Amino acid sequence: SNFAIILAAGKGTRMKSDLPKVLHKVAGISMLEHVFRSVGAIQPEKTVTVVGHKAELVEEVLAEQTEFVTQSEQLGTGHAVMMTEPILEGLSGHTLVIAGDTPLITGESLKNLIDFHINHKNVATILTAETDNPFGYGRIVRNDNAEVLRIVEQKDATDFEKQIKEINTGTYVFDNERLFEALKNINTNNGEYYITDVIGIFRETGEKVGAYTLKDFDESLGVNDRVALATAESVMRRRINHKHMVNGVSFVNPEATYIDIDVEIAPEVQIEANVILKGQTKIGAETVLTNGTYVVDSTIGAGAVITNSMIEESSVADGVTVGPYAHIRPNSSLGAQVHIGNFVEVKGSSIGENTKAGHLTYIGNCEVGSNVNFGAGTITVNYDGKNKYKTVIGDNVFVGSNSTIIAPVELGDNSLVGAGSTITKDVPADAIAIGRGRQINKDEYATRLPHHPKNQ
Amino acid sequence: SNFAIILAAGKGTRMKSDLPKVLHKVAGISMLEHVFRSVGAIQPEKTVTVVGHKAELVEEVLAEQTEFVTQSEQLGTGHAVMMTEPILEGLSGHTLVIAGDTPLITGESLKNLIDFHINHKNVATILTAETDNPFGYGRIVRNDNAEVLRIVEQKDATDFEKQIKEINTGTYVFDNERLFEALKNINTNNGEYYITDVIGIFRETGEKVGAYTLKDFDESLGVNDRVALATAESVMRRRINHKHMVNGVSFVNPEATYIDIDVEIAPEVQIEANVILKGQTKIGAETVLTNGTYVVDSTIGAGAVITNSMIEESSVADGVTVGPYAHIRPNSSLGAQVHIGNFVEVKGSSIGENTKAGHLTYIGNCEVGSNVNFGAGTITVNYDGKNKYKTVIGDNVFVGSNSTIIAPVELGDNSLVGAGSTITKDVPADAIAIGRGRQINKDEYATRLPHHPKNQ
Amino acid sequence: SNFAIILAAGKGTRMKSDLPKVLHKVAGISMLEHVFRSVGAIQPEKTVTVVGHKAELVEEVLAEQTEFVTQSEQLGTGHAVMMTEPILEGLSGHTLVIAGDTPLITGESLKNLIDFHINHKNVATILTAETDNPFGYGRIVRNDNAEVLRIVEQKDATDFEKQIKEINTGTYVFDNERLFEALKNINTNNGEYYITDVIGIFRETGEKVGAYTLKDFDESLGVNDRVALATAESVMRRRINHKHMVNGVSFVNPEATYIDIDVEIAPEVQIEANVILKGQTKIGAETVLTNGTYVVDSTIGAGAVITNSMIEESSVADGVTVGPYAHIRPNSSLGAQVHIGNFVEVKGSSIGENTKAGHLTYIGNCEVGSNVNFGAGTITVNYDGKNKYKTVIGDNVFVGSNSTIIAPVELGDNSLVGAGSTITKDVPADAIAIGRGRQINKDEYATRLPHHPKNQ
Ligand SMILES: COc1cc(OC)c(S(=O)(=O)NCc2ccccc2N2CCCCC2)cc1NC(C)=O
Ligand SMILES: COc1cc(OC)c(S(=O)(=O)NCc2ccccc2N2CCCCC2)cc1NC(C)=O
């Protein structure tokens, strides 16, 4: 049996934030959730998360996923772990201890760590890593058969010890029964106390302590400030986009393309640099996303072309073309082959197959049929100061350019609205509606106006 | 005499694509065309390209540039090269063999390779490179005078051989006559066969095999998946933008600026990060391109300022200002000093010198004279559902804000269209035209409406 | 006493520019000003800047900050420094000599350089650096006690000397009196002359020459072309954004976010990749800036959300929301909680608290009260060809969608403008104003029009 203890009690002072430190997001989810995902690879029988600062915010994030225990104040990692003792005491197994602020550690690394532990029948295994600049980190002191003798902190380090390159990442696997027996010893013997103290207890008793070394040092990143949060973001970005490229997705610049951890992207999608895909977004096969495009919680079908446009909480069917500079706002649905062109906003509207709105148009709170045409400058009007009205537009409606459609009004199938019209009442199917002043010319009169070349 | 054989027969399974692998684009052209360009530096007397998977797509790309031969199925590099034998057999010279999927190899490297070959009178020269992580690559085994003894693949490598850092890039120069004599030997002696086999034949006969080492390992990149395609993109980007900067072009961020291989840019142009220039685009002296700007197949004159705007298949004269957020669509011409401001679209239109359209305007299928003014919100209307009409606007026309101009109509020189007008017929030069309803106020009435503060 | 001599006389031929080389900008200010800022850390009693090519442009940049002297033609660094002799001759102290083209050198490095100098009572201290690729640079030759013996240029270097990794950065501290005594010796003994010559004079006299080595080689960057200018930009960017992140600002991608040297950003601001902040801009606490956002010389309050929008020379109060794709042009003020949505332009206008303009709207030269509403498509009209008029809009005005407001006109408190209206005269408080043609339907008529499905 494996168990996991996740440390998530800390504030994070250097973040300059009132968030619990582990709740800051990387690629769309908290550091804590990244750590939780990796922990899952060990198939823990029990997962206990230690909360402290703003416990309720963390308890919302992992609600129903973990047991919680609380440490009332900061008395160190040893005390943190002690809060889990009423749950874990006396159980037979292997217990991972990991902090919520190391979001790059992978489930493959945790499983290799656990296997290493079990395979070498260690009583404790330290997950270590190796760096050319170890200043600041506890050094790993091994004897000649490569067992850990101790963990020496920077301050207490002899000059020879400072040359040591192998560092303690602060993540461990312990024999669960021995872990709580040793911590009680430390506890009863005294005001902070440290999970590293247990290593020294096992060194007193000659029990076997080992170290399993991460192949990639960046995985050991402990995030304590926004500098480190942006590093984690960069490593995570490269990780996500590499998965995509292996899966058949093209990136002009995968180091400068911003896709959240749970976004899904079908093979043969082509993504230019500086595209942003956020939350529960899905992109269908062969779709093209050009530079500047920003999609959040939306589904986009196959063979679409999203040109520098922002789409939010909406569905976009196959073959749709949107942009450049269009805005599809929440609860919109764009049916197959629809075209939405520049400076067009769609809000709260269903738009039927093959309909086109190429320019300078606002479609708000409309139900729109198939093969509809909106001339440039068409404005739908839904809000009077209190009421929000709906407009119904049938199939094959032709809405003339620069018309103003005042809801609630129905345009029946095949009707036409004259360019420049203000529409205040229903238009029956097959009818036209014209609501505009007629043009009167006056010859010669421009001559007295300021734009005239002679007055220039 | 030099000859070249380019391998372009392969599918590319890991690409997850139905394209021939060499047709995927880097900086605007296929990998294959990049390789073709580099090959040209050797001044080959004959260039033969070996096609296989979707031969017709490759044959379109290099139409009239190369001879083609076809390999009907994948029986290895040796068989690929054998398809060129009816063309190259018995000719005296030096024959480069290079794959269409190594798009970073430069013509300078190929010429140094050929010269090395000729100068050392090798019978075969392997283009090699050196890496600290050689796992996977054929290792180059040299004797003490530094001649190649053999090429050892990963699988057949002894442990001492795996330490070898010098790898086979899969690009070679062969004595042409000896090349086909040796391949026939291999062929008649048997079902894949390999161009590396020829090296072993020359080792049997004691003929001189050499190795010329690339100074830059990244040049040896063989692109087999979209991860590697994005690496090639990144190396190519840096290569292109460095040429630009040496030529006098400023880059806020040349690692994050996306300019195609054949774009031309005059000295003193200033380019912000995240600008995209594609296809046959030219940018004249001192022009400024701000972040987000996207130009495809367009010419832009000197002293222009293109602010976060997209321009396609169009010409932009000197001193023009476009943007932010404007869209110049195909077949537009913007005359000297024109101004196109925010949320303005120009399509299929010629716009004369000094004309201005600063806001929320669509100019579609218009011929526009000089010193014209378009008020904010002006909509031209060209499409009725079937016909596409033209509008003619003379010099010094003043088009009032939020007017709707319904083609085909002519506005004569110096005429004015009243703000808010729907224009359905011609306006003579020096005339005004007003087509709008007159304002009627009703005092006190807002009091019963939902926006009123008291109802709030 | 410390003195500083800044070299700013050179053209910069490889820049392909007519600017003085030191005036090219990095992160918003010239290289020269960066060097001036770092120089200030030594608290110089006198700062003298040597000008030459287009002296007047440099003299504007540092007007009132430095003494100037002119070198009439390029006769080398020794002559450059000699121009400062009528000012500095005979004064007791330590004199930094630094070029205006090394903009990454920090004031902390200059102070460590000066302290090193004073502490080791050197007569000259060379600021050196160490690189694995020293080709091109003067090498530092030290004897066994580590004193500098000489500076050997590439050309005159023996093969053993070319292996030397420690290079001369071209920045120095000299004993001021000895500096001018030695230069006169060199001068009277002859047509270029070099500040390095003074090192050889001190080697003749056995006076103490030392070297202080920069910890970071990138600081030694001398910018001679636009390639190097973009490197300086990249190092500076990372430097600025790291200061921000330490201060509590989140960056999705601080390697691809473009913030000028004097921009101020409060803690807890969140900045997506590809945001541009320029000049005297300030961003208040917790404000969010999304990808594409571009702010120049503007103040933005606390808790605002600026979504992909461009803001120039304007003030934005707390809690304002702007964008996506909006443009706040010079001299605008957006009061607390205002909302400006997509394709909206604000120019030269004051907009009162809680007012909303969500779409396709141009507000130009208006004074706008609080809790005003602008329907989509509203156009204000201020320019007739000569005059620029103002419009006054009172509190709680409701401007109907696609209205055209022709200045000078006043809309009184709580008034309403009917959707689609052209407004040519004042509207009293509590009144409505309607100026549009009434809708007339004709049944059946669409049947003869081109959009009808049957004609399709
Ligand atoms: C050129 O495109 C248009 C022409 C139009 O009138 C000639 C009108 S219209 O709306 O004024 N009238 C519809 C129409 C279509 C075709 C032919 C004639 C007409 N109208 C003539 C005048 C009375 C209504 C029919 C609209 C468009 N197109 C757009 C995109 O709005
Ligand atoms: C303030 O800018 C305008 C004023 C206008 O009327 C006072 C009109 S107008 O189009 O209604 N009339 C033209 C005009 C210009 C100057 C002075 C008077 C007028 N009109 C007065 C009423 C009849 C037509 C002349 C247009 C503009 N400007 C824009 C950008 O449209």
Ligand SMILES: COc1cc(OC)c(S(=O)(=O)NCc2ccccc2N2CCCCC2)cc1NC(C)=O
């Ligand atoms: C649905 O939103 C609107 C309805 C309107 O008329 C029914 C008008 S209106 O401007 O035509 N008339 C104002 C109005 C508001 C509420 C109820 C009725 C009315 N009008 C009815 C007809 C005469 C004027 C009052 C404007 C809006 N909204 C926008 C954003 O413009």
